[PDB]
């Protein structure tokens, strides 16, 4: 079978780290296995433009392997041309770069599988880190040191402890729950969640969380809000001007989920106006983020409150080996004809939604 | 009585934030309270040089109030000129900017009091933040964004999860233990500590910590080392070239304790050479840190591994009110002649060591 693998290029950085499996140079470390199994592997990072390498090979690819950090956007237009496509794999977590609703509406017999759980710890750590960086005003503090300055008050005037703050997560699944678990020993005033899926009651009690029934009530009382739900029709553009106006004034917002859950310019305006004290995360729409994307230069009134990074929290070296192995396992389930996928990896099975986490179906 | 209060200046930043008690503009909230009692309060940030405002007032100061973030260095030379000095207060935690050994060894009848516990949560939070920032390679990641670039592999090549790492604290007192507590839900491989004061078994078991009684054995197995002991003769220069050569190669080192626990040039050489992958923290010797201090510009081979900030973790707005109130309480205990200090606040009582945490006596 013909397999098209779209990853980020490491360029000169490939020579620095052999454990960087998630790049085009290294092919998830599964190329030997795919060659021995008798398959043809096309590897590229060229995913934009009508004559990209991706588009040249879409018409007869049996399988497309993608990765969220450099996402091949498997649009309706591409799906219609993909005459042999039977399986799309996500080397990572989050399948929103594929037009899942289109596959489902047309009933096309395409399965979509992701490596659930492979980098959920990595993401939760990044949430905790970004919360602490924003609350404690770390970015301008480090900027002072490397700019050869020293002025404690310029940092302290907007630096707080996370202790005593009320923290809310939108989405309390694998990442959201792991965030709540990691926050417990920081002595927050309270931990809150909003999710149409209730936490198991034992899990709720372990972290002292309180479920809040609607999102407006959730954000209005939160000093810190974190977004940990997938991107789907019910979350696209969820964090917009109107909802942001119901946040607690001066809240901190963290989003390692998906960029498009927020309206980009609305977040930036809330930060510039003071409605938010800070925003940070690793995810953008689209990716790669253009040089002039508004989340790069946005700041609060003090010139800070920006903890943005490129999309990498789920591609730490520890995460990469896990989602590479999980990608291999998915492919093997397909190649053998067993289709013995782990239940939690299945987004679509031959066009049908199996996941419950991408809204109600 | 004549009181000399040495704090940092907030300048234009005082107007941005009324909760900034710890600057010369706002005088810990005690200026009118002192004036009403008939005391003369001299407030200054001018603390260096033979005719500094501090030195002008040392000879007849009854009380000197200091703060670690802008520390008046109460050296033996100054103590010898301080003919009326009876009490040095630390608005914060850590009394090493005072020559405690000289006071004690020469029979100077000077008490030294600090606001124990007032910002130990704040410091522990900063340790967790710095560990995450270094391990997850946040600083170059944010720099890439604000420089209008996008290259996931440039960051991922040296980005790890904290999960699965072995973490060691040198010092397991209020901050060190709070660090261990916050690390538990991050699923480290193991938590280790080295302290001449053992943790109670119950405290050890709560965080799953293992005591290591030899410092070289401790650092040799640790992916991450954090310093959480006071600065005294026993810890000054403890982190030198020879001990660093026994660190695990490519370890991360966090120091929010005191800068002079490390030999500054030895740390920088270890970072540049790769013996450390990263160093970070908020504390320097001396403070303010000179523009040429080697910890400003030091980097690892990738241009990263530096998470330095100015000394602010213990002067977040949440901390400042706690140590301002604690300073007022200490002063009242002195002025009333009750001397009913909280026992945990007493470093020296009339020259004698009461604390056990500054070495054995
Ligand atoms: N930044 C990264 O590198 C990275 C890494 C992993 C995952 N992610 C993203 O995080 C998302 C969540 O990952 P996970 O492992 O926690 O997934 P998960 O499926 O375990 O949990 C998602 C939770 O979100 C809930 N949810 C769905 N819609 C919601 C809505 N409108 N409001 C509130 N809750 C809603 C779901 O019910 C579920 O409980 C992924 O889908 C992915 O987009 C990013
Ligand atoms: N960066 C900040 O703003 C900030 C804030 C608060 C405290 N600090 C610094 O952190 C230090 C510790 O604070 P704390 O509240 O945890 O103090 P603490 O007195 O509760 O704990 C200090 C621990 O260090 C141990 N110790 C002393 N010498 C040691 C040695 N050679 N090796 C190993 N352990 C040793 C002590 O036995 C004690 O258990 C303070 O003295 C201060 O210098 C910095
Ligand atoms: Cl929904
Ligand atoms: Cl000692």
mmCIF file of N, CA and C in Angstrom, chain B residues 167-172 180 190-201 203-205 207-215 217-219 221 360:
data_model
loop_
_atom_site.group_PDB
_atom_site.id
_atom_site.type_symbol
_atom_site.label_atom_id
_atom_site.label_comp_id
_atom_site.label_asym_id
_atom_site.label_seq_id
_atom_site.Cartn_x
_atom_site.Cartn_y
_atom_site.Cartn_z
ATOM 1 N N UNK B 167 14.340 13.663 40.762
ATOM 2 C CA UNK B 167 14.450 15.051 41.211
ATOM 3 C C UNK B 167 14.949 15.087 42.650
ATOM 4 N N UNK B 168 15.954 15.913 42.895
ATOM 5 C CA UNK B 168 16.618 15.983 44.190
ATOM 6 C C UNK B 168 16.592 17.410 44.713
ATOM 7 N N UNK B 169 16.209 17.574 45.973
ATOM 8 C CA UNK B 169 16.322 18.861 46.646
ATOM 9 C C UNK B 169 17.432 18.829 47.689
ATOM 10 N N UNK B 170 18.244 19.877 47.679
ATOM 11 C CA UNK B 170 19.252 20.142 48.703
ATOM 12 C C UNK B 170 18.601 21.127 49.663
ATOM 13 N N UNK B 171 18.184 20.628 50.815
ATOM 14 C CA UNK B 171 17.314 21.359 51.703
ATOM 15 C C UNK B 171 15.878 20.910 51.563
ATOM 16 N N UNK B 172 15.298 20.408 52.643
ATOM 17 C CA UNK B 172 13.917 19.952 52.677
ATOM 18 C C UNK B 172 13.184 20.587 53.844
ATOM 19 N N UNK B 180 8.621 19.364 46.932
ATOM 20 C CA UNK B 180 8.343 17.936 46.823
ATOM 21 C C UNK B 180 6.850 17.664 46.767
ATOM 22 N N UNK B 190 11.441 9.462 40.875
ATOM 23 C CA UNK B 190 11.686 9.435 42.303
ATOM 24 C C UNK B 190 12.021 10.840 42.777
ATOM 25 N N UNK B 191 11.656 11.112 44.028
ATOM 26 C CA UNK B 191 12.010 12.339 44.722
ATOM 27 C C UNK B 191 13.032 12.020 45.804
ATOM 28 N N UNK B 192 14.118 12.796 45.818
ATOM 29 C CA UNK B 192 15.235 12.628 46.735
ATOM 30 C C UNK B 192 15.471 13.921 47.495
ATOM 31 N N UNK B 193 16.016 13.805 48.699
ATOM 32 C CA UNK B 193 16.411 15.000 49.426
ATOM 33 C C UNK B 193 17.669 14.747 50.231
ATOM 34 N N UNK B 194 18.409 15.827 50.448
ATOM 35 C CA UNK B 194 19.633 15.846 51.242
ATOM 36 C C UNK B 194 19.498 17.022 52.197
ATOM 37 N N UNK B 195 19.531 16.748 53.502
ATOM 38 C CA UNK B 195 19.376 17.773 54.531
ATOM 39 C C UNK B 195 19.895 17.162 55.820
ATOM 40 N N UNK B 196 20.684 17.916 56.587
ATOM 41 C CA UNK B 196 21.123 17.376 57.872
ATOM 42 C C UNK B 196 19.965 17.207 58.847
ATOM 43 N N UNK B 197 18.832 17.847 58.583
ATOM 44 C CA UNK B 197 17.613 17.632 59.336
ATOM 45 C C UNK B 197 16.773 16.662 58.525
ATOM 46 N N UNK B 198 16.568 15.470 59.060
ATOM 47 C CA UNK B 198 15.707 14.522 58.380
ATOM 48 C C UNK B 198 14.266 15.021 58.372
ATOM 49 N N UNK B 199 13.541 14.652 57.331
ATOM 50 C CA UNK B 199 12.104 14.810 57.367
ATOM 51 C C UNK B 199 11.519 13.751 58.299
ATOM 52 N N UNK B 200 10.434 14.058 58.997
ATOM 53 C CA UNK B 200 9.714 12.992 59.701
ATOM 54 C C UNK B 200 9.306 11.910 58.714
ATOM 55 N N UNK B 201 9.312 10.655 59.175
ATOM 56 C CA UNK B 201 8.940 9.564 58.279
ATOM 57 C C UNK B 201 7.579 9.818 57.640
ATOM 58 N N UNK B 203 6.233 12.652 56.878
ATOM 59 C CA UNK B 203 6.411 13.628 55.812
ATOM 60 C C UNK B 203 7.097 13.002 54.603
ATOM 61 N N UNK B 204 8.134 12.184 54.832
ATOM 62 C CA UNK B 204 8.789 11.473 53.737
ATOM 63 C C UNK B 204 7.780 10.644 52.962
ATOM 64 N N UNK B 205 6.984 9.847 53.675
ATOM 65 C CA UNK B 205 6.072 8.928 53.007
ATOM 66 C C UNK B 205 5.002 9.671 52.218
ATOM 67 N N UNK B 207 5.229 12.344 50.433
ATOM 68 C CA UNK B 207 5.765 12.708 49.128
ATOM 69 C C UNK B 207 6.596 11.600 48.504
ATOM 70 N N UNK B 208 6.654 10.421 49.125
ATOM 71 C CA UNK B 208 7.477 9.332 48.611
ATOM 72 C C UNK B 208 8.952 9.653 48.491
ATOM 73 N N UNK B 209 9.484 10.488 49.372
ATOM 74 C CA UNK B 209 10.855 10.942 49.239
ATOM 75 C C UNK B 209 11.831 9.964 49.883
ATOM 76 N N UNK B 210 13.017 9.871 49.288
ATOM 77 C CA UNK B 210 14.108 9.082 49.847
ATOM 78 C C UNK B 210 15.245 10.010 50.259
ATOM 79 N N UNK B 211 15.712 9.857 51.495
ATOM 80 C CA UNK B 211 16.838 10.634 51.970
ATOM 81 C C UNK B 211 18.131 10.019 51.469
ATOM 82 N N UNK B 212 19.004 10.869 50.947
ATOM 83 C CA UNK B 212 20.361 10.515 50.564
ATOM 84 C C UNK B 212 21.302 11.297 51.464
ATOM 85 N N UNK B 213 22.236 10.600 52.099
ATOM 86 C CA UNK B 213 23.038 11.262 53.119
ATOM 87 C C UNK B 213 24.356 11.821 52.600
ATOM 88 N N UNK B 214 24.717 11.537 51.352
ATOM 89 C CA UNK B 214 25.939 12.024 50.732
ATOM 90 C C UNK B 214 25.548 12.865 49.520
ATOM 91 N N UNK B 215 26.049 14.101 49.459
ATOM 92 C CA UNK B 215 25.581 15.045 48.442
ATOM 93 C C UNK B 215 25.996 14.601 47.043
ATOM 94 N N UNK B 217 26.410 11.481 46.023
ATOM 95 C CA UNK B 217 25.501 10.403 45.671
ATOM 96 C C UNK B 217 24.152 10.957 45.229
ATOM 97 N N UNK B 218 23.675 12.006 45.910
ATOM 98 C CA UNK B 218 22.406 12.648 45.552
ATOM 99 C C UNK B 218 22.442 13.198 44.130
ATOM 100 N N UNK B 219 23.427 14.035 43.819
ATOM 101 C CA UNK B 219 23.382 14.734 42.544
ATOM 102 C C UNK B 219 23.692 13.788 41.401
ATOM 103 N N UNK B 221 22.589 10.933 40.624
ATOM 104 C CA UNK B 221 21.455 10.193 40.107
ATOM 105 C C UNK B 221 20.291 11.093 39.725
ATOM 106 N N UNK B 360 25.078 23.932 62.217
ATOM 107 C CA UNK B 360 25.054 23.424 63.574
ATOM 108 C C UNK B 360 25.842 24.368 64.472
#
